[PDB]
C-alpha cells in the first residue's frame, strides 16, 4: 500500500508536469506563428514597394 501511494504520487506529478510543458509549447508555438506572420507581412510589403517602384 505504501509503495502504491508513492508511485501514484510520482505519476500524478508527472502528469501535471507534462500538462505544464504542453501549455508552454503551445505558447511558444503561438509566438512562432506570430513571428512567421511578421515575416510574411514584411516580405509582402517589400514586394509591394518593389512592384510600385518598378511600375512607378
Amino acid at each position: 500500500s505504501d509503495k502504491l501511494k508513492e508511485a501514484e504520487t510520482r505519476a500524478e506529478f508527472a502528469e501535471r508536469s507534462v500538462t505544464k510543458l504542453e501549455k508552454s509549447i503551445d505558447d511558444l508555438e503561438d509566438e512562432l506563428y506570430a513571428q512567421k506572420l511578421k515575416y510574411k507581412a514584411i516580405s509582402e510589403e517589400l514586394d509591394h514597394a518593389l512592384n510600385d517602384m518598378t511600375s512607378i
Partner: protein, 371 residues
C-alpha cells in the same frame, strides 16, 4: 434616399452606396453546389454557397461562374448572387433604394431586358438604370474626353469618347480577358509538371497569376534572358506546401494580351485594337485621344503594362503626336467610383427608369430614351 451602385462584373461583384470612395463589399461571383455525399447529420449543410463563403469551402464544391463573357448564361444563379449582395453584404432591402447596374458594350438585348425585368419584379426596386462600363471609368478619371480600354475579367472593350459625345461606330469589343489568361496560364504550367484540373484549382492558378505574372517590356529579350540566367524564377507556396517555381511562364501568361495568337484567337492585341479604334475616329480628334488614353479594369493591373502599351502605340502612331497613358492606382474600382460619381449627380436624378414607366411599356423600356 441613397442609391445602390451595384456593378455585376464577371469575376468580382462590387457594390456600395452612392457617394463613397470604395465599394462596400467586394466578393467573387461564384455559386458552388456541394458534390460529395455528406455523412454528418445536423451539420447545417446548405445547398449552395455563394460569394466569399464558397471561396473557403471550395475544397468540396464545384464553383461555376454565372457570367461567361459579359452576358449572363445562368439566370437563376445570377438572381441568387444579387439576392445575396442585397441582403447579406449590404443588409438593405431593395424596396427603398434605386439601383445602377453596369453592362458591357455590344451585349445581347435579351440580357439587359431580363436584368431589368428581374430588378423590377423579384427585388421590386423603385427605379434602376443601366450604364455602359466605360463611360463610368471615364467619369472616375475626371476627364471628359479620351479613349478608355476597360480590360475586365470577362471581356475587353475599348470605347472612345470626345467632349462627352460617344462615337458608337468606333467601339472595338474583344473577348480576351482575365479568364482566358487564367486558362492559358493553367495550360502552360503543365510544361513543368504541375497539373491543375479541378474547378477549385482554377482559383489557385488565378492567385498565382495575380501575385507573380508581369508584362515584359520587350518580349524576345525577356525570353532570351530567362533561358540563360535564373534571376526570374520566383517560387510560390501552394495551399498545402510543395512550393512551385515559375520560370518564363511569368511574362508569357500576360503576353497573350498583345499576341492573341497564343490562345488561337485571330484578332490583334490590345496594343493594336486601340490604335484601330482611334483611326476610325474623325481626323480632328485623334490628337486628344492619343494624349488621353485611359486604362481601367482589373486585368490592366499587371506590373509594367503602362509602359509596354505606350511603347507599342508610339511605334504605331505618327512620330509627332504625344502618347500618354493614364493609369490611376485605383484602377480596379475605377468603374465603380465612376458609377458612384454619376449616381451622386443632381443633373442625372431624372434619368432613372421609374417603375410606373416600366409598367406602361414593359421591359423593352431600357432600349428607349431612358437608355
Amino acid at each position: 434616399t441613397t442609391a445602390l451602385v451595384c456593378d455585376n462584373g464577371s469575376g468580382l461583384v462590387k457594390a456600395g452606396f452612392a457617394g463613397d470612395d470604395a465599394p462596400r463589399a467586394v466578393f467573387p461571383s461564384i455559386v458552388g453546389r456541394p458534390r460529395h455525399q455528406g455523412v454528418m447529420v445536423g451539420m447545417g449543410q446548405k445547398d449552395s454557397y455563394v460569394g466569399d463563403e464558397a471561396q473557403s469551402k471550395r475544397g468540396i464544391l464545384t464553383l461555376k461562374y454565372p457570367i461567361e463573357h459579359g452576358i449572363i448564361t445562368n439566370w437563376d444563379d445570377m438572381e441568387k448572387i444579387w439576392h445575396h449582395t442585397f441582403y447579406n453584404e449590404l443588409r438593405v432591402a431593395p424596396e427603398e433604394h434605386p439601383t445602377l447596374l453596369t453592362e458591357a458594350p455590344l451585349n445581347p438585348k435579351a440580357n439587359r431586358e431580363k436584368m431589368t425585368q428581374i430588378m423590377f419584379e423579384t427585388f421590386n426596386v423603385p427605379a434602376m438604370y443601366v450604364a455602359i462600363q466605360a463611360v463610368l471609368s471615364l467619369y472616375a478619371s475626371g476627364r471628359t474626353t479620351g479613349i478608355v480600354l476597360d480590360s475586365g475579367d470577362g471581356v475587353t472593350h475599348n470605347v472612345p469618347i470626345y467632349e462627352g459625345y460617344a462615337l458608337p461606330h468606333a467601339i472595338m469589343r474583344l473577348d480576351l480577358a482575365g479568364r482566358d489568361l487564367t486558362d492559358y496560364l493553367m495550360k502552360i504550367l503543365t510544361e513543368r509538371g504541375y497539373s491543375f484540373v479541378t474547378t477549385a484549382e482554377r482559383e489557385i492558378v488565378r492567385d498565382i497569376k495575380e501575385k507573380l505574372c508581369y508584362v515584359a517590356l520587350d518580349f524576345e529579350n525577356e525570353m532570351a534572358t530567362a533561358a540563360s540566367s535564373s534571376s526570374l524564377e520566383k517560387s510560390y507556396e501552394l495551399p498545402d506546401g510543395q512550393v512551385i517555381t515559375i520560370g518564363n511562364e511569368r511574362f508569357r501568361c500576360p503576353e497573350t494580351l498583345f499576341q492573341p495568337s497564343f490562345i488561337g484567337m485571330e484578332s490583334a492585341g490590345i496594343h493594336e485594337t486601340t490604335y484601330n479604334s482611334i483611326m476610325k475616329c474623325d481626323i480632328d480628334i485623334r490628337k486628344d485621344l492619343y494624349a488621353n488614353n485611359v486604362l481601367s479594369g482589373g486585368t490592366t493591373m499587371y506590373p509594367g503594362i503602362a509602359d509596354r502599351m505606350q511603347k507599342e502605340i508610339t511605334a504605331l502612331a505618327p512620330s509627332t503626336m504625344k502618347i500618354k497613358i493614364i493609369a490611376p492606382p485605383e484602377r480596379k474600382y475605377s468603374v465603380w467610383i465612376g458609377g458612384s460619381i454619376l449616381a451622386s449627380l443632381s443633373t442625372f436624378q431624372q434619368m432613372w427608369i421609374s417603375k410606373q414607366e416600366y409598367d406602361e411599356a414593359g421591359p423593352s423600356i431600357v432600349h428607349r430614351k431612358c437608355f
